[PDB]
């Protein structure tokens, strides 16, 4: 037979599998289009959500009832402790797909970034970039490696670390992100721009301008094992029903003999 | 507009042959209709 009355599916199957994010933090994944003709610009920056607020605004939207009128909107402040670049990663465009062509680390890596490397800093032996510091320091090795990137790399990225001392949280260990460098006329200019930013602070003001629109990526708030009614949006069944009303009633037909992945099932929400 | 242009447009718009099946814009002296596999039925119309 047929559903009789037409009703849409509940939930986006695109957002399946609905599992707790195994990746530690929200990852950039894809980065903005390079363009190949703009002042060289970094494309991203990590932030810690601080809070939300009200902002009174004046609207200049021509053709809208709000034109020449005031409005109040929800704002979301994202705390932005200034990040520091610690390395430069170049990526060749290979037939298989973007694949790295070696990274050049900073001669001096800060303790917050080193804290990320270990599970317990106090009980660890601090053996990170120990022979690297000796291989560099003179810095001749760093330039030679950067030169290898200039010929073998087509997409340049800057590794950067947040300092969590200047943020109210207790993270103490830094968060590392590969921020892409885009817009320069050529790859040799891009790595030259990167060397100037190396081991020096980057601030949100430089990365993003007021009036631009940005895409915010993060792990959502976790609700734990949720019921189908909260997790997928289904109806709470009639209150005269035995064995519960907080459950999808029928999870499939006789055939297919197996429960389909489409059907809403109870799991982790958040 | 000018009558020469009206006739020029007619050549591009109402001077045609349409098969009864393909409903296609077949050529004027078309023995068969290409799209309809060659049914010989044909006609056209004007305002």
């Amino acid at each position: 037979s047929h559903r009789k009355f037409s009703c849409c599916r509940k939930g986006n199957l695109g957002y399946l599998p609905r599992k707790r994010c195994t990746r530690g933090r929200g990852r950039c994944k894809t980065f903005p289009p390079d363009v190949q003709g703009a002042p060289i610009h970094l494309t991203a920056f990590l932030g810690y959500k601080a809070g939300c607020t009200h902002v009174m605004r004046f609207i200049d939207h021509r053709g809208s009832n709000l034109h020449n009128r005031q409005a109040i909107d929800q704002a979301t402040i994202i705390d932005a402790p200034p990040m520091i670049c610690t390395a430069i990663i170049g990526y060749a465009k290979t037939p298989k797909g973007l694949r790295a062509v070696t990274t050049v680390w900073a001669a001096h890596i800060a303790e917050p970034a080193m804290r990320r490397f270990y599970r317990n800093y106090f009980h660890a032996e601090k053996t990170a970039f120990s022979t690297y510091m000796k291989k560099a320091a003179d810095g001749t090795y760093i330039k030679e490696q950067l030169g290898r990137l200039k010929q073998h790399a087509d997409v340049i990225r800057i590794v950067a670390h947040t300092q969590p001392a200047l943020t109210p949280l207790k993270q103490k260990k830094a968060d590392i992100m590969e921020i892409q460098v885009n817009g320069g006329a050529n790859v040799a200019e891009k790595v030259d721009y990167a060397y100037a930013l190396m081991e020096k602070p980057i601030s949100i003001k430089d990365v993003f301008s007021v009036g631009a629109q940005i895409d915010t990526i993060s792990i959502t708030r976790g609700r734990g094992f949720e019921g189908v009614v909260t997790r997928w949006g289904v109806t709470r069944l009639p209150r005269k029903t035995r064995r519960g009303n907080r459950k999808v009633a029928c999870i499939g037909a006789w055939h297919p003999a197996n429960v389909q992945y489409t059907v809403a099932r109870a799991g982790q929400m958040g | 507009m000018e009558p020469t242009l009206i006739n020029l447009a007619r050549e591009y718009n109402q001077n045609m042959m349409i098969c009864r099946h393909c409903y296609a814009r077949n050529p004027l002296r078309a023995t068969n209709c290409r799209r309809c596999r060659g049914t010989n039925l044909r006609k056209k119309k004007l305002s």
Partner: protein, 194 residues
Amino acid sequence: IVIDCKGHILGRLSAIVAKELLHGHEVALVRCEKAIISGAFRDVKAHYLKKMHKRTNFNHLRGPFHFRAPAEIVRRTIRGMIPYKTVRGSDAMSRLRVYDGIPPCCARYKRVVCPSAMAYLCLRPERRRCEVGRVAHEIGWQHAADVERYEKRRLEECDKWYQDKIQIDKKIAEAAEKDAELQRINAELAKYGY
């Protein structure tokens, strides 16, 4: 046995290749985007997109897996002619390497082209021959341009090496005369004829 896949019909070479695999020969196929599939492109794409419809309704992860890359398209075609389920079949699908473009790994390997499966001999002029590389891009492969960008550089590199090889071989000819003279006089024309 590295066979340049260029110009071969997918099925015709796959039959020849499956036999050499099930007979304990290790075989690698390169430039598999340049392999041909007889049939107008419209039909080929249709038969490949009809393929990508057949997926398990209950969970599409246990469903028939369709791989967009043109190398994997061949690997699935050879797998059809190989009893992959048996150890004789699994160990033989292991001895097959499929590469889209000749890769750094198979750059210096000697390459042999199987004439029986080559398209110009196999199919009549006027059969709208398609290539897998064109078909692969439509069904989803995302790296057609990247293979083209890399093999342009590889081919340019081969041309520089070719001038050197010609000078190296002209030099080998002036070193023809040796006990090789005796060996050729004994075999190449005398009695054996080889």
